[PDB]
Paper text:
GDE possesses the α-1,4 glucanotransferase (GT) and α-1,6 glucosidase (GC) activities, and removes glycogen phosphorylase-digested branches in two steps56. Its GT activity transfers a maltotriosyl group from the branch to a neighbouring non-reducing end, and forms an α-1,4 glycosidic bond between them. The last residue on the branch is subsequently removed by its GC activity. The structures revealed that CgGDE is composed of four domains, and adopts an elongated structure.
We expressed Candida glabrata GDE (CgGDE, 38% sequence identity to human GDE) in Escherichia coli and crystallized it. A multiple wavelength anomalous diffraction (MAD) experiment using a selenomethionine (SeMet)-substituted crystal gave an excellent electron-density map, which allowed us to build the complete structure. Two very similar protomers were found in the ligand-free crystal. Protomer A contains residues 3–1,528, and protomer B contains residues 4–284, 287–330, 336–341, 345–432 and 442–1,528. Residues 629–651 have the largest conformational difference. In protomer A this region adopts a loop structure. In protomer B this region forms a β-hairpin that contains an inter-strand disulfide bond between Cys634 and Cys645, and sticks out of the structure. The orientations of residues 237–458 in these protomers are also different, and are related by a 6° rotation. Our dynamic light-scattering experiments indicated CgGDE is monomeric in solution, like GDE in other species.
Numbering used by the authors: 3 to 1528
Write the structure that this text describes.
């Protein structure tokens, strides 16, 4: 069925973190295969790679992966296969990796660079864990219990062992770990292995014998099995080591050690001779030991040559300077330092006259001088005749060249013997570990740093033996030439074992790799898995090759490791790459009670009532997606990984920290008896067993063996004494974990609380799905340390049950046999007394311990959270999509959005937004307001957040979410969305308080997503099928369109009405604005498919035409304000846009609006019969504009007087407009005016600007003439289709012009008037006064404005013309001018309203500024430098269009030959929208600002979400979509 995880990638191909669980690994959860299917039948998992539309990495991009393409094919690490990324600017691409088998996969991406070169990402890995079963019940990897058993103490026969098996089987472990079962070396330590390729001959003779024993364990006891494996060494006496000595590091393979070798056999030769010389074979004084290493002083150091190994042979160089003085006999460069700089001459020679490998170590005198390039320098520098001063000089230099070599040596030597007088102390005189064995055959003073033998090739050899550096970096190979550890004696050794020298591969030690390869596959055929000592010292390529070999033999190879690399990061890399399935953690390492609870915290699980993940506002919601619609397409037999809700967005694949195997005791640590006490065995083991992880223990721990068994020496056998000490308790713990393991699954489904008081440690373990749990109280016996009483234990909304309790007591000392290892005797007393109070009111359980609860005791309760049952999560995850069945794009506004003020509108000021104490209010009232706060909270599991705090403190926020909708209950679909939220929130309130936040954030999240999905569906495909960014943009449409009480777009009715902005442009007269609506209409209503409500808005304003113009301030069409010269042209572009896009859209032109003013510009009689009095068709309306402008319009604003505008001057109120017919363009306004969009009217009395406009745009304005032109084009071709009756235009006199002449006049004259040529040359035909100029290659802001330099201003507006009337521009000039805009006028998120180089340029806007500045005070700045966002859309729409026409690099081939744009252009486009995607991502309002101060700087007065800021961006995407995606 469904076994698919989503793995989102960044724009740089990197996998994205869904959650913050820590430094981690992309593990996929172990799960049984479905019911009755083997490896192969189907994919085990499918990983969905998701790649962001338009990202750099989509460019000729490929997914690489070493994941085999079906089952038949074998995994090869470096065989990567190719996968093609389907580019689009709109839609993300998804690429499945099907995975047939467990192991270590990876992927990287290749793409073509911004330099047109190839590039390549990091490799990224993910592990697919093995399936363990035993006969045919599945073992969840975290309900593993493993017993480590050392073979050589099990008895010398197989059924002496099968005895041991039967004992652990009773304690109910289900895994055994074997130290290696391989014929062992001279010291018989089971890690120094004699022969890798056959087993211990004491017991076994063939593979078949051991195989049967292990299959027996399986079948008899349900116990899986796994071995140690050793890579790092082999036993100092293997008969193949005589054959192949090169497989270790010898004087041949690794020369550097030669010096260290002759130091090591200068003590196998010193310490038998040592009893003849000097006083101490054994003594334990401290003034004495000086007389020993004063025996090292002279007998070794002194007799080893001052170490010619570093130092150049001074006289036997000079020697060979006289010999061959005569051959290459001078230099003649001036590479020559003189004898002034006695140290720079010194290594000048070092650079130029040396034989290879100078400085480094080798054979004894291997550092030496190239003599005829030495004589050749000396000849130039001093003399050609030797007898003139050369013996002095050559020697002087060479003494100076060895100065740093000598102090290399003194530092070297002091470590050689310090590392020695500190060792032999603790080796003999006991600091903390006794045994002063003097000399022997077998035990000299110092240990064998090398293994000596005569080989079958005949020559002698010295292979070292490995060990570890005290606090060295284990990633460093200390046998390798990088280290000096064998020389300085910085190596704690193992004589048992010998170097294994693998190289960079099989070519570097061929037999070694071959032998280990069929060593590894041998055990793989038998065992379920490996264990790996000191894996941080196995080089990565080595470890990877062999574990991969193993996994081909055994697909389900389980792998454990003791891995303590430098850091958590390198731990995770090793895990990543090697395919390690568990890491070894050690309970016994804790020095203290606090260290232990900390450890138990790490591997315990997640906090109780932790937040659960959901798709929020950061995911796409494909309109075309599958759903579980009552979360019911699951079947428990299928063993499907499950979607977070009804929507099938699949489970995400995120980093998780690598799993653990927690060992209460390993076969290398000291005993409870030793390190703490024996009675500790019981609690220490219980705390560990309560961890949500895998647990294990060595044999002996449970049976309380008194001291750690010496792996090397001991030959006594495990007692057969059954059921001692903890045995009976381990049976309980492991049995309990079996019951558990059946239902917990991934990291979010088991939770924990751990408390440490004194010598107690508490542990509450809880299942997040059903609320069942286990409470462990554990008194600890690190020392006997006095009676301690523990506080009462309070469990909220929980009932609790006694399960079991125990004390474990020492009955004197351990017996002293010499052939049977035996336990300490112990009493295991069952305890009683525990009191369990339940308050039937507060629903609180309290738990009192009894005063007889000695250290070394435990008690276990079963416990059940109230109100949670197994069926809760179905409930919460079902019903939500049907409950949204009836929503509409309007009604979704009420559920998701609604600023406080917009809510006050419906509540008569009573209600507003929920105030989170210590925090504030969400920014919307509906679910977007919660979700915008929740997304980070969930991501960091921040249960400390004020909202989290509030949500468990009380049900208020819970109830607020449900109650608001009473305001909007009657709206389409809101009733049934409310009822879903009611029914779920009801059921949540019945939970334990601390569980409420996680569940509140889940109900909200689920309904949010369902709502956002519903929107995408109701919208048009281009939007319903695109990236997060675009859908984010689109959702804005729903933010802005709302019905209200205090306003509408219709004077008779309240109906949906596009606000200009939230919160401040949402209520009363402040909501609707013609300019705003009709710029934004195509963006937010056409592009999104909101056709019927685009229409309503055009019809609404068409009622309010007057003076042949459209009003900006719309007062629901009840006294609108007509100071808008721009608005009518944006509105008659909106009508074109509508007709162009909407199917059957010409239908609009004969729609009839009751025109509710009179056909003059007559007075204001809102309440007459002459209001409803006469009909206009949109047909007449359009011409009525075009024609009335033509004949001329002159008026003074109705009701003009201070009661509209109380800063506009008397003259300001009469404005007007007509056409210069030598050019055909519209003119209008004055210096007392504000008829454009840039309409800031100045008002500071202290700055002296009251009634001065900041930016009147008097005269010919680029937008309006652009738009006019576009109107004329539109009607002409409409005439040609018989959809427009008119060609007649009357002028002031009475003359007539065809529309098509007016059209052609603009065509012949627009570019002439506005353009400002590059070449001074042609200033005589583009109407220019060069004195007043700023930048050429520009399109003018205005033609013949009041103050001429405002004509020659570089501004973003001309762009609107470029977009709507491209015909007006000779491509090359346009391209050039928009390039200038890109360089000069483009902010990060918004368009610079005035060229920085202008002296008027003030780019910070503050509306309250009181000060005396003429340009800035009280906001006058508004449009002279601040960065506006809608302008950007027009800007980039045009930048797209004209680069596409101009620049050959911006085109490529079509299918069915049509020019589409190149990826070179798409990149440029994409670059310019990152900051917008960033903005709407990371803004509490889920939208784009109206405006920005200089260079991105946030502007506090800017509206945070603006209709046209987002509409204009959408306008871009729609261009691209409707022009290319077919």
């Amino acid at each position: 069925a469904h076994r698919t995880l989503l793995l989102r990638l960044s724009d740089s191909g990197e996998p994205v973190t869904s959650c913050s669980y820590g430094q981690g690994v992309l593990t996929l959860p172990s799960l049984p295969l479905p019911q009755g299917k083997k490896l192969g039948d189907m994919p085990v998992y499918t990983v969905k790679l998701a790649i962001p539309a338009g990202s750099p990495v989509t460019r000729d991009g490929l997914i690489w992966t070493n994941c085999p393409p079906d089952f038949s094919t074998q995994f090869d690490r470096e065989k990567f296969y190719k996968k093609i990324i389907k580019t689009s600017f709109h839609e993300d691409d998804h690429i499945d990796l099907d995975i047939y088998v467990p192991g270590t996969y990876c992927f990287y991406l290749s793409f073509k660079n911004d330099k047109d070169e190839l590039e390549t990402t990091r490799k990224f890995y993910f592990v697919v864990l093995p399936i363990l079963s035993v006969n045919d019940k599945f073992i969840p990897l975290n309900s593993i219990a493993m017993q480590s058993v050392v073979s050589k103490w099990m008895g010398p026969t197989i059924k002496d062992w099968e005895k041991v098996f039967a004992r652990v089987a009773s304690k109910k472990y289900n895994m055994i770990h074997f130290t290696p079962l391989q014929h062992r070396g001279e010291s018989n330590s089971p890690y120094s292995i004699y022969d890798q390729l056959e087993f211990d001959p004491t017991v076994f003779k063939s593979e078949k014998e051991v195989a049967d024993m292990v299959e027996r364990l399986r079948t008899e006891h349900n116990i899986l099995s796994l071995t140690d494996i050793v890579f790092n060494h082999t036993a100092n006496n293997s008969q193949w080591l005589l054959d192949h000595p090169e497989a270790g590091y010898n004087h041949k393979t690794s020369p550097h050690l030669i010096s260290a070798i002759e130091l090591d056999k200068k003590l196998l030769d010193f310490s038998e001779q040592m009893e003849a010389l000097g006083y101490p074979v054994d003594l334990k004084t401290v003034d004495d030991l000086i007389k020993v290493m004063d025996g090292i002083k002279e007998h070794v150091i002194g007799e080893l040559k001052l170490w010619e190994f570093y130092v150049v042979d001074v006289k036997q160089t000079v020697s060979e300077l006289r010999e061959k003085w005569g051959n290459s006999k001078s230099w003649s460069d001036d590479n020559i330092p003189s004898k002034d700089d006695s140290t720079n001459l010194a290594q000048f020679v070092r650079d130029n006259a040396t034989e290879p490998g100078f400085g480094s170590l080798g054979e004894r005198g291997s550092n030496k001088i190239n003599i005829d390039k030495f004589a050749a320098i000396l000849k130039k520098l001093h003399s050609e005749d030797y007898n003139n001063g050369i013996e002095e000089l050559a020697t002087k230099i060479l003494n100076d060249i060895n100065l740093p070599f000598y102090k290399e040596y003194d530092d070297d030597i002091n470590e050689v013997l310090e590392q020695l007088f500190n060792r032999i102390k603790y080796l003999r005189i006991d600091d903390h570990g006794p045994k002063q064995g003097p000399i022997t055959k077998k035990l000299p003073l110092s240990e064998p740093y090398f293994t000596r033998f005569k080989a079958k090739d005949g020559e002698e050899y010295a292979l070292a033996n490995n060990g570890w550096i005290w606090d060295g970096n284990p990633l460093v190979d200390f046998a390798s030439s990088q280290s000096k550890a064998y020389l300085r004696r910085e190596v704690i050794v193992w004589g048992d074992c010998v170097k294994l020298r693998y190289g960079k591969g099989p070519s570097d030690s061929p037999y070694l790799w071959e032998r280990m390869s069929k060593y590894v596959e041998m055990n793989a055929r038998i065992f379920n898995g490996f264990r790996i000592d000191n894996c941080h010292s196995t080089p990565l390529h080595v470890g990877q090759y062999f574990l991969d070999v193993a996994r081909r033999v055994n697909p389900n190879l389980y792998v454990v490791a003791e891995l303590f690399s430098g850091s958590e990061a390198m731990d995770c890399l090793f895990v990543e790459r090697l395919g390690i399935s568990s890491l070894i953690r050690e309970a016994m390492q804790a020095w203290s009670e606090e260290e232990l609870s900390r450890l138990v915290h790490r591997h315990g699980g997640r906090p109780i009532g932790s937040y659960k993940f959901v798709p929020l506002d950061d995911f796409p919601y494909p309109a075309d997606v599958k759903i579980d619609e009552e979360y019911c397409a699951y079947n428990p037999d299928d063993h499907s990984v499950k979607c977070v809700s009804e929507i099938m967005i699949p489970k995400t694949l995120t980093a998780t920290p690598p799993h653990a195997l927690f060992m209460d005791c390993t076969h290398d640590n000291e005993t409870p008896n030793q390190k703490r006490t024996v009675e500790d065995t019981l609690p220490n083991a219980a705390l560990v067993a309560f961890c949500s992880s895998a647990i294990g223990s060595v044999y002996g721990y449970d049976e309380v063996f008194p001291q750690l068994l010496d792996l090397v020496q001991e030959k006594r056998t495990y007692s057969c004494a059954e059921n001692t000490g903890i045995s009976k308790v381990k049976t309980l713990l492991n049995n309990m974990r079996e019951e558990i393991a059946s239902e917990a699954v991934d990291i979010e489904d088991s939770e924990m609380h751990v408390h440490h008081d004194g010598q107690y440690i508490t542990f509450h373990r809880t299942n997040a799905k059903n609320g069942k749990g286990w409470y462990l109280v554990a008194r600890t016996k690190f020392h006997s340390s006095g009676d301690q009483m523990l506080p009462r234990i309070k469990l909220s909304q929980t009932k609790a049950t006694f399960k079991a309790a125990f004390s474990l007591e020492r009955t004197g000392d351990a017996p002293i046999s010499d052939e049977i290892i035996e336990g300490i005797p112990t009493k295991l007393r069952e305890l009683t007394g525990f009191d369990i109070g339940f308050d039937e009111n507060t629903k609180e359980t309290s738990i009192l311990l009894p005063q007889d609860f000695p250290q070394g005791s435990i008690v276990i309760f079963e416990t059940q959270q109230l109100g949670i049952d197994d069926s809760l999560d179905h409930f919460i995850r079902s019903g939500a999509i049907k409950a949204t069945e009836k929503l509409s794009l309007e009604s979704i506004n009420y559920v998701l959005y609604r600023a406080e003020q917009e809510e006050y509108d419906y509540s008569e000021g009573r209600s507003g937004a929920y105030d989170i104490p210590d925090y504030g209010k969400p920014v919307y009232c509906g679910l977007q307001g919660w979700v915008s706060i929740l997304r980070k909270i969930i991501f960091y599991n921040d249960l400390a957040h004020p909202l989290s705090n509030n949500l468990r403190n009380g049900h208020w926020a819970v109830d607020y979410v449900v109650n608001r909708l009473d305001l909007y209950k009657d709206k389409e679909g809101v009733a049934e969305v409310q009822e879903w939220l009611r029914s779920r929130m009801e059921r949540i309130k019945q939970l334990p308080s601390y569980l409420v936040p996680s569940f509140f954030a889940l109900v909200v999240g689920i309904m949010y997503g369902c709502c956002r999905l519903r929107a995408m569906q109701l919208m048009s495909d281009n939007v319903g099928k695109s990236t997060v960014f675009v859908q984010s943009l689109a959702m804005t449409s729903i933010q802005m369109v709302s019905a209200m009480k205090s306003t509408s777009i219709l004077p008779d009715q309240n109906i949906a009405a596009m606000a200009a902005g939230l919160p401040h442009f949402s209520t009363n007269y402040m909501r609707c604005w013609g300019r705003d609506v009709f710029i934004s209409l195509r963006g937010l209503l056409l592009t999104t498919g909101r056709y019927e409500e685009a229409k309503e808005h055009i019809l609404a304003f068409a009622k309010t035409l007057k003076h042949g113009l459209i009003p900006n301030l719309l007062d629901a069409g009840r006294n609108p304000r007509y100071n808008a010269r721009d608005a009518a042209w944006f509105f008659v572009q909106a009508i074109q846009d509508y007709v162009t896009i909407v199917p059957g859209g010409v239908s609009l032109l004969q729609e009839k609006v009751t025109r509710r003013f009179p056909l003059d510009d007559e007075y204001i009689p809102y309440d007459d019969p002459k209001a409803f009095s006469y009909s206009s068709t949109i047909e007449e309306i359009i011409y009525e504009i075009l024609n009335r402008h033509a004949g001329g319009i002159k008026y003074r604003e109705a009701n003009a007087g201070p009661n509209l505008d109380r800063v506009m001057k008397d003259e300001g109120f009469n404005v007007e407009v007509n056409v210069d017919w030598e050019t055909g363009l519209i003119h209008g306004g004055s210096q007392f005016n504000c008829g454009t969009w840039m309409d800031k009217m100045g008002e500071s009395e202290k700055a002296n600007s009251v009634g001065v406009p900041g930016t009147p745009r008097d005269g010919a304005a680029v937008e309006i003439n652009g738009l006019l032109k576009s109107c004329l084009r539109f009607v002409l071709q409409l005439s040609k289709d018989g959809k427009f009756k008119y060609t007649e235009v009357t002028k002031p006199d009475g003359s007539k012009i065809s529309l098509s002449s007016w059209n052609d006049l603009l065509q012949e004259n627009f570019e002439r008037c506005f353009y400002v040529p590059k070449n001074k040359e042609d200033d005589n035909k583009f109407e220019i006064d060069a004195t007043i100029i700023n930048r050429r290659g520009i399109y003018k802001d205005l033609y013949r404005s009041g103050k001429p330099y405002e004509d020659y201003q570089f501004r973003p507006n001309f762009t609107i013309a470029m977009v709507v009337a491209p015909e007006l521009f000779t491509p090359d000039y346009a391209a050039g001018a928009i390039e200038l805009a890109d360089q000069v006028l483009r902010g990060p998120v918004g368009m610079r309203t005035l060229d920085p180089s202008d002296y008027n340029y003030r780019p910070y806007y503050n509306n309250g500024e009181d000060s005396d500045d003429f340009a800035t005070s009280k906001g006058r700045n508004y449009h002279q430098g601040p960065e506006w966002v809608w302008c950007y859309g027009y800007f980039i729409r045009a930048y797209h269009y004209f680069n596409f026409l101009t620049n050959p690099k911006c085109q490529v081939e079509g299918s069915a030959k049509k020019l589409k744009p190149s990826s070179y252009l798409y990149r440029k486009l994409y670059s310019r929208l990152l900051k917008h995607r960033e903005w709407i991502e990371n803004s509490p309002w889920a939208g784009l600002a109206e405006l920005t101060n200089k260079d991105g700087e946030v502007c506090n007065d800017s509206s945070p979400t603006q209709a046209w800021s987002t509409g204009c961006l959408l306008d871009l995407f729609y261009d691209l979509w409707i022009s290319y995606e077919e």
